[PDB]
Every structure is written in structure tokens, then in C-alpha cells.
Design a protein around this ligand. Structure first.
Ligand code: CLA
Ligand code: CLA
Ligand code: CLA
Ligand code: CLA
Ligand code: CLA
Ligand code: CLA
Ligand code: CLA
Ligand SMILES: CCCCCCCCCCCCCCCC(=O)OC[C@H](COP(=O)(O)OC[C@@H](O)CO)OC(=O)CCCCCCCCCCCCCCC
Ligand SMILES: CC1=C(/C=C/C(C)=C/C=C/C(C)=C/C=C/C=C(C)/C=C/C=C(C)/C=C/C2=C(C)CCCC2(C)C)C(C)(C)CCC1
Ligand SMILES: CC1=C(C/C=C(\C)CCC[C@H](C)CCC[C@H](C)CCCC(C)C)C(=O)c2ccccc2C1=O
Lengths: 329, 73
């Protein structure tokens, strides 16, 4: 994900510094159709989850999208290995097992496609509209990394390719978090675990195969994956092995929240606060000749993005690693 | 004769909207033309938010002050 957003960034830089290719001359249809496909994908894919949530809450499981109810079979997801029936085991563990795809896999894969397409939309818009646009016609003169062009024309905030990356990084992080959660839950529920005894084995999975039944709802994701599987990391303080992981969980939550400061606030408030503070220093004759300044707009965005991504990644890192370490030992 | 402060002398800026309001700068020059509304030119060691070091002030927006001491603006 990080290197893909990087490729988008440096594509934008190349467009700014050099002449672009001729596919930029019909950029409006390209980005328009990408916008439409993003909207349609998000609507359908996420609204299936929302429909499942609402109907299940109302008490109508027969109306939801699931294997027992209306089912969205992934017809195109076909085997190619041609493996023999069964699973491969090694000393009380399942080294290899076929992943069986159903409505949950259909829904999660289309969520993946939606998020990938939205990230691609942000990156491609930044690349194609880097030199100029209907809003501002001298974006090339403005450069690559500028905060805006002004409050004019309604407001030209984050029109630069740098800001387009600044948003595409958020979207890449969202996509990768969903991918990580999908992989983690699916592997725990349907692949990993132990077995209990031509011989037939009953496979006891770590998550107990709850992905196919609970993953069909956002509430199921919230309960069976985050809340239920955060027991290890949340209750890791006394345990010698993973107390560090619990503390890092807490600290990553703190850092992620602290990023919202920079992501929501603006330069002028902090500059005025700094001046008011500096009044007292000048009063007491503490005169810093490297005059304090509030972080620039682009720097504030960068700091917020860095802290946001780092905190989220740290929370996920600690959560998954604590769960795995405890379960395997 | 010299209408404004002497060249090189320190003057305290009395323009309320100035970044250097109530602080002192050095009189770079004074325009002797009577038709100049803001003849005095004052430079300050502290650049304002626009990274500007000097400015023009009227004769009533600057008063003569001693040179800043240690730790004084
Ligand atoms: C005159 C109404 C009208 C018409 C004919 C269209 C037509 C179109 N819109 Mg839509 N659109 C509308 C209003 C309309 N829009 C409004 C008000 C908004 C702002 C929220 C949008 C926002 C919007 C976006 C963001 C996008 C489209 C897109 C599209 C195109 C594909 C269809 C689609 O997915 O629409 C989905 C959106 C709709 C609003 C559906 C159309 C609305 C119908 C005609 C409503 C008719 C019934 C109405 C609810 C009755 C209420 C009566 C009551 C008050 C008494 C198509 C050219 C997509 C596109 O360009 O694809 C290439 C696209 O990306 N539209
Ligand atoms: C909107 C875009 C979109 C995107 C990004 C994806 C993404 C994905 N789909 Mg597909 N899918 C789509 C639409 C889309 N789908 C639609 C509309 C349907 C019909 C309900 C399906 C039905 C479907 C199934 C059943 C499966 C996938 C699967 C997949 C995966 C790729 C492998 C595959 O078999 O693709 C197949 C892709 C298609 C069948 C869609 C063909 C491309 C579009 C629809 C052509 C339309 C163009 C047309 C000529 C003009 C339309 C004009 C307009 C005005 C109406 C991936 C997660 C597989 C997977 O991994 O599931 C877990 C899988 O099993 N999709
Ligand atoms: C990050 C996003 C993401 C994306 C874009 C996809 C995309 C895809 N996944 Mg999915 N997947 C994801 C995350 C994602 N996955 C995660 C996080 C997991 C959890 C581990 C899975 C687990 C998973 C499984 C278990 C399977 C898929 C499969 C697929 C494919 C859908 C079936 C299809 O129509 O194949 C259409 C195209 C083909 C069937 C041809 C594939 C040719 C192969 C790769 C090489 C053949 C070489 C030689 C001839 C033999 C498609 C390429 C299915 C698949 O078959 O993938 C290859 C499948 O069985 N995925
Ligand atoms: C300056 C005041 C302040 C302080 C001290 C905190 C403190 C906290 N916030 Mg934050 N928060 C604040 C203002 C503040 N907030 C504001 C104004 C908002 C906007 C509404 C938020 C919005 C917010 C959210 C949305 C979240 C937090 C979270 C947290 C907790 C993080 C976990 C922890 O124990 O970190 C402290 C632990 C450490 C190890 C810090 C170590 C620091 C050095 C090394 C000492 C913590 C209690 C998170 C939380 O609790 O999630 C469950 C969380 O998600 N806060
Ligand atoms: C944008 C914010 C900003 C920045 C960049 C600076 C920068 C500086 N200020 Mg400060 N200052 C600020 C805001 C800021 N100030 C504000 C708002 C005020 C109030 C008006 C002041 C008032 C002020 C005064 C009055 C003085 C300074 C001084 C200094 C200097 C000393 C820094 C220091 O303590 O190093 C300490 C840094 C460390 C210990 C960090 C090292 C940590 C490890 C070793 C490396 C880190 C690794 C990294 C994290 C990767 C892992 C430095 C040039 C002092 C100065 O110039 O003294 C000569 C000084 O006298 N500042
Ligand atoms: C005050 C309440 C509070 C607050 C403010 C937070 C804040 C946070 N938690 Mg949470 N958390 C809480 C309570 C809270 N938590 C409690 C009580 C627990 C139980 C101990 C946890 C356990 C926990 C874990 C184990 C994790 C978090 C994560 C996070 C971070 C999310 C960052 C982000 O952008 O995610 C963006 C949000 C998402 C990606 C959605 C995740 C959850 C939904 C249900 C997934 C749905 C998937 C489905 C397919 C649909 C996807 C649609 C797609 C288009 C996105 C953030 C620091 C996670 C994180 O870092 O996320 C990356 C993480 O690892 N928390
Ligand atoms: C949740 C997502 C995730 C996961 C599961 C992992 C997993 C891993 N990363 Mg990490 N990594 C991630 C995101 C993630 N990474 C991201 C987003 C980046 C880009 C910045 C990196 C960049 C990165 C590098 C450059 C390296 C790793 C390494 C590792 C391995 C050891 C983990 C460790 O303790 O690192 C080190 C953890 C710390 C230093 C944290 C301690 C600091 C304070 C106390 C907290 C392991 C395979 C290392 C490896 O391969 O080792 C052999 C390694 O060199 N990762
Ligand atoms: C996994 C965790 C990490 C996730 C990261 C997510 C992506 C991060 C994206 C960051 C932006 C790109 C950075 C390249 C550079 C970049 O963004 O520059 C370009 C951008 C805007 O450019 P300007 O308009 O400021 O350009 C003016 C000058 O740079 C001259 O060109 O500047 C910033 O955002 C500044 C960021 C501060 C960088 C200073 C770092 C100093 C490190 C030491 C600090 C430690 C002490 C504090 C505690
Ligand atoms: C630079 C750039 C970027 C990025 C990009 C990217 C990220 C790319 C990627 C790319 C890629 C990564 C590609 C790949 C491709 C692939 C291929 C081409 C393959 C295919 C396959 C095949 C052909 C197969 C088939 C089959 C079937 C179907 C069945 C059975 C048999 C077989 C196996 C044969 C962005 C937008 C950001 C910005 C601008 C610039
Ligand atoms: C808080 C904030 C500021 C003010 C923040 C500033 C000036 C940062 C302060 C920089 C310090 C001096 C760097 C030194 C590093 C930290 C003090 C390290 C602390 C480490 C702890 C573990 C102790 C802005 O200027 C700003 C600008 C634009 C958008 C958002 C914001 C914004 O959110």
C-alpha cells in the first residue's frame, strides 16, 4: 500500500516537472467513470453489510445476504491447483487447508475492490489534474506541494497533488486495515487451528469458524473480531509475554487520537496562541531570535497523517500479535 | 531641515496594526518631501509573518527611543 501511494505521488511529481502523456487530454471521462464506479462499488458492497445489519436487527435473517439466506455465490472464484481432497497437518496443526468461498467472501472481496478503486481514484485525480483544472489554471505555476490557491473561487483547499496523496494515504490505510482484518479473521476461523481424530479429523479453529456466520454484518465484525479477539491484548498487562503489546496498544490509541489535533485544527489558531505565549517570554526578557512559528499548513497535514497512520498501524499490530502469541502459546 | 528622526536612530513603532508595534527599529531613512504620508523607513531585526524586515511609517507613528538592551525587543 505504501509503495503504491508513493508511485502515485511520484507520478504527480513527474507530471508537474515534465510533459505528461496524451491520456491526460481526456482526463475528465477517465476520472468521471472512476468516480461512478467507486460510488456504485461502495454503495452496493457496503450497503449489503448495512442491509444485513438492519434486517438482522429487525429480526429477519431470511431477508439478509448470507449462505442460509439470500446468498451471493462467487461463481468466478474457481480452483486452479487441482489439489486432492482433504487438508495437510503437521504435529497438531493445520499447515494447509482449502479456503471455502461464500457470501461473506463475495462481500469482503467487493469491499476490497471498492477501497482499492477509491484509493486509485484519489491518486489518479491528483496525477491527471496536477498541471491545471477548471478551478485553477496555473496549478503548474503553483507547483507540486502547496497548501491551496486561496479562499477564492469558493475555496481551493488541498488542490495540490501533495494533498491528493495526503488523502490517498488515508484511503490506502483504510483499505489495508480492512484487508488485514479479513485475512486475520478468515485464517483464524477457516484455516488455522488444531485437529481431533482413511481417517477423518474434526478441525477446531482458533476463531471457531465464525467468519462465515458473523462477518456478514458490521456488528459481527465489531464484536467477533475487534471486541472478542482484543481479549488477549486488552488483558495482557499481568502476562509477562504480551504486557508490552498491551501497553503499545494503549499508546497507539493515544497517538492516533493525538493526530486528530493536527488533522482538524488550523495554522492561525496556533500562530495566535504562540504569539500570546511569546508575550510572556518577551515580558521576562526570554527573547528567542529564531522566532517561534506555527507549523505550515502542509506540515500540519503531514504530521497529522503520520501520527494517524502510525497509531492505527500500532493498534492493529499489537492486537494481532498479542492474539497470535497467546493462542499459539 | 530634518523633519523626522535622525538616520540610524532607534524609534519605537506606534502603529497598532504593525507587527513591531511598541517595539523599536532603526530609522533607515526619512523622505523630506512634504507630500509623503509615510516617509520614515524603519528596519527591524525580527521579520514579520511575511518575512519582511523593513516598513514605512508616518512621523506620528514613530517616537524616539533608546537602543534595545540585552533581552529587550
Ligand atoms: C434530475 C435529476 C437527476 C438525474 C436525471 C441524474 C442523472 C444521473 N446521475 Mg445523478 N444526481 C442528482 C440528480 C440527478 N442525477 C442529484 C440531485 C445529485 C446530488 C446528490 C446527483 C449526484 C450524482 C452523482 C454524484 C453521480 C450521479 C450520476 C448520475 C448518472 C448515472 C445515474 C446514477 O447513478 O445516478 C445516481 C444518483 C441519483 C441522484 C439518481 C438520479 C435521481 C432520480 C432521477 C430521482 C427521481 C425520483 C425522485 C427521488 C422523486 C422524488 C419526489 C418527491 C420529492 C415528491 C446520471 C446521468 C453518476 C454519474 O455521473 O455516473 C457516470 C454519479 O457519479 N448523480
Ligand atoms: C463494479 C465493479 C466491480 C468490481 C470492481 C468487481 C470486483 C470483483 N468481482 Mg465482480 N461483479 C460486478 C462488478 C464488479 N466486480 C458485478 C456488476 C457483478 C454482477 C452482480 C459481479 C459479480 C461477481 C462475482 C459473482 C464474482 C465477482 C468477483 C470479483 C473479483 C474479481 C474476479 C472476478 O471474477 O471478477 C468478475 C467480474 C465481473 C463478473 C464483472 C464484469 C465487469 C463489468 C460488470 C462489465 C460491465 C460493462 C458493460 C459492457 C457495460 C455496462 C454499462 C452500464 C451503463 C450498465 C473482485 C472482488 C469474484 C470474487 O472474487 O468473488 C469473491 C466472484 O466470484 N464479481
Ligand atoms: C487485497 C485485496 C484482494 C484482492 C484484490 C483479491 C482478489 C482475488 N482473490 Mg482474494 N483474498 C484477499 C484479498 C484480496 N483478494 C484476502 C485478504 C484473502 C485472505 C487470505 C483472500 C483470499 C482468497 C482466496 C482463498 C481466493 C481468493 C481469490 C481471489 C480472486 C477471485 C476469484 C476470481 O475470480 O479469480 C479469477 C482468476 C483466476 C481464477 C485465475 C488465477 C490464476 C492464478 C493466480 C495463477 C495460475 C497459475 C497456474 C496456471 C496454476 C482474485 C484474484 C480466489 C482465487 O482463485 O484467487 C487466485 C481464491 O480462491 N482470495
Ligand atoms: C490533552 C488532553 C487529552 C488527553 C491527555 C487524552 C487522553 C487520551 N485520549 Mg484523547 N482526546 C482529546 C484530548 C486528550 N486525550 C481530545 C480533545 C479529543 C477530541 C474529542 C480526544 C479524542 C480521543 C479519541 C477519539 C481517543 C482518545 C484516546 C485517548 C486515551 C488514549 C489511551 C491512553 O491511555 O493514552 C495514554 C497512554 C500512554 C502510554 C501515553 C504515553 C505518553 C508519554 C510517553 C508519557 C487517553 C485517555 C483513545 C482511547 O482511549 O481509545 C480507547 C481514543 O481512541 N482521545
Ligand atoms: C515550531 C516550533 C518550535 C521549534 C522548531 C523550536 C526550536 C527551538 N527552540 Mg523554541 N520555542 C517555540 C517553538 C519552537 N521552538 C515556542 C512556541 C516558544 C515560545 C515563545 C519557544 C521559545 C523558545 C525559547 C525562549 C528558546 C527556544 C529554543 C529553541 C531551540 C532549542 C530546542 C531544544 O530545546 O532542543 C532540545 C531537543 C531535544 C532534547 C531533542 C533531542 C532528542 C533525541 C536526542 C533525538 C530525537 C530523535 C527523533 C525523535 C527520531 C527517533 C530550537 C532552535 C532555545 C534556544 O534557541 O536556545 C539556544 C531558547 O532559548 N524556544
Ligand atoms: C473510545 C473508544 C474507542 C476509540 C476512539 C477507538 C479508537 C481506535 N481503535 Mg478501538 N477499541 C475500543 C474502543 C475505541 N477504539 C475498544 C473498547 C476496544 C476493545 C478492547 C478496541 C479495540 C480495538 C482494536 C483491536 C483495534 C482498534 C482500532 C482502533 C483505531 C482505529 C483507527 C482507524 O482509523 O480505524 C478505521 C476503522 C476501520 C478500518 C474499521 C474497523 C472496524 C470495522 C467494524 C470493520 C468492518 C469491516 C467490513 C468489511 C466493512 C469495511 C468497509 C470499508 C469500506 C472500510 C483507533 C485508535 C483498530 C485499528 O487500528 O484499525 C486500523 C484496531 O486494531 N480498537
Ligand atoms: C500491522 C502491520 C505490520 C506488521 C504486522 C508488521 C510486521 C513486521 N514488521 Mg513491520 N512495518 C509496517 C507494518 C507492520 N509490520 C509498516 C507500515 C512499515 C513501514 C513503516 C513497516 C516497516 C518495517 C521495517 C522497516 C521492518 C519491519 C519489521 C517487521 C517484523 C518485526 C516487527 C517488529 O517488531 O518491528 C520492529 C518494531 C519496533 C522497532 C517497535 C518498537 C518501538 C517502540 C518501543 C514501539 C515483522 C515481519 C522488521 C523486520 O523485518 O525485522 C526482521 C523491519 O526491519 N517493519
Ligand atoms: C507507519 C507510520 C508512518 C506513516 C507515514 C504516512 C505518510 C507520511 C507522509 C509525510 C509527508 C511527506 C514527507 C516528505 C517531505 C514533505 O512532506 O515535504 C513537503 C511538504 C510541503 O512542502 P512545503 O510547502 O513545506 O515546502 C517548503 C520546503 O520544503 C522547501 O521545498 O512539507 C511537509 O509536509 C513537511 C513535513 C515535516 C518534515 C520534517 C521531519 C523532521 C523529522 C524530525 C522530527 C522529530 C521531532 C518532532 C517530534
Ligand atoms: C504507475 C501508476 C500508478 C500505479 C500503477 C499500478 C499500481 C500498477 C499495477 C500493475 C499490475 C500489478 C499489473 C498486473 C497485471 C497482471 C497480469 C497481466 C496478469 C494476468 C493474468 C492472467 C493473464 C492469467 C490468466 C489465467 C486465467 C484467467 C485462468 C487460468 C489460466 C490463466 C492463469 C492464464 C498509479 C495509478 C497509482 C498512479 C499513476 C501511475
Ligand atoms: C498543534 C498544532 C500546531 C502547533 C504545534 C507545534 C508548534 C509543534 C511543536 C513542535 C515541537 C517544539 C517539536 C519538538 C518535539 C516534541 C516536543 C516532542 C515531545 C515528545 C514527548 C515524548 C515528550 C500547529 O502549528 C499546526 C499547524 C497546522 C495544522 C495543525 C497544527 C496543530 O495541530
Amino acid at each position: 500500500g505504501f509503495f503504491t501511494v508513493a508511485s502515485g505521488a511520484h507520478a504527480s511529481i513527474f507530471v508537474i516537472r515534465q510533459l505528461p502523456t496524451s491520456e491526460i487530454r481526456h482526463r475528465d471521462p477517465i476520472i468521471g467513470h472512476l468516480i461512478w464506479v467507486c460510488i456504485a462499488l461502495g454503495l452496493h458492497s457496503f450497503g449489503l453489510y448495512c442491509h444485513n445489519d438492519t434486517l438482522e436487527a429487525l429480526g429477519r435473517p431470511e431477508d439478509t445476504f448470507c449462505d442460509n439466506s439470500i446468498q451471493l455465490k462467487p461463481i468466478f472464484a474457481k480452483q486452479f491447483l487441482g489439489l486432492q481432497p482433504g487438508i495437510e497437518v503437521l504435529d497438531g496443526k493445520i499447515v494447509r487447508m482449502t479456503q471455502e468461498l461464500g457470501t461473506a467472501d463475495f462481500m469482503v472481496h467487493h469491499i476490497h475492490a471498492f477501497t482499492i478503486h477509491v484509493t486509485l481514484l484519489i491518486l489518479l485525480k491528483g496525477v491527471l489534474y496536477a498541471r491545471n483544472s477548471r478551478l485553477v489554471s496555473d496549478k503548474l505555476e503553483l507547483g507540486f506541494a502547496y497548501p491551496c490557491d486561496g479562499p477564492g473561487r469558493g475555496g481551493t483547499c488541498q488542490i495540490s497533488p501533495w494533498d491528493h496523496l495526503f488523502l490517498a494515504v488515508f484511503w490506502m490505510y483504510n483499505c489495508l486495515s480492512v484487508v488485514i482484518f479479513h485475512y486475520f479473521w478468515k485464517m483464524q476461523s477457516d484455516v488455522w487451528g488444531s485437529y481431533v481424530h482413511h481417517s477423518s479429523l474434526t478441525c477446531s479453529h482458533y476463531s471457531q469458524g465464525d467468519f462465515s456466520v458473523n462477518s456478514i454484518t458490521i456488528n459481527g465484525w465489531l464484536r467477533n473480531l475487534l471486541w472478542s479477539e482484543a481479549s488477549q491484548v486488552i488483558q495482557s498487562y499481568a502476562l509477562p509475554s504480551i504486557c508490552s503489546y498491551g501497553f503499545i496498544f494503549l499508546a497507539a490509541h493515544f497517538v492516533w487520537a493525538f493526530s486528530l489535533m493536527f488533522l482538524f485544527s488550523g495554522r492561525a489558531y496556533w500562530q495566535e496562541l504562540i504569539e500570546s505565549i511569546l508575550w510572556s517570554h518577551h515580558k521576562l526578557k526570554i527573547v528567542p531570535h529564531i522566532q517561534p512559528r506555527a507549523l505550515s499548513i502542509s506540515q500540519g497535514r503531514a504530521v497529522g497523517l503520520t501520527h494517524y497512520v502510525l497509531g492505527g498501524i500500532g493498534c492493529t499490530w499489537a492486537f494481532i500479535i498479542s492474539r497470535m502469541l497467546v493462542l499459539t502459546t | 531641515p530634518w523633519v523626522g528622526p535622525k538616520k540610524g536612530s532607534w524609534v519605537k513603532v506606534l502603529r497598532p496594526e504593525s507587527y513591531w508595534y511598541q517595539t523599536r527599529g532603526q530609522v533607515v531613512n526619512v523622505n523630506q518631501k512634504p507630500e509623503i504620508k509615510y516617509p520614515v523607513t524603519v528596519k527591524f531585526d525580527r521579520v514579520n509573518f511575511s518575512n519582511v524586515n523593513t516598513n514605512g511609517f508616518a512621523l506620528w507613528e514613530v517616537i524616539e527611543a533608546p537602543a534595545p538592551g540585552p533581552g529587550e525587543v
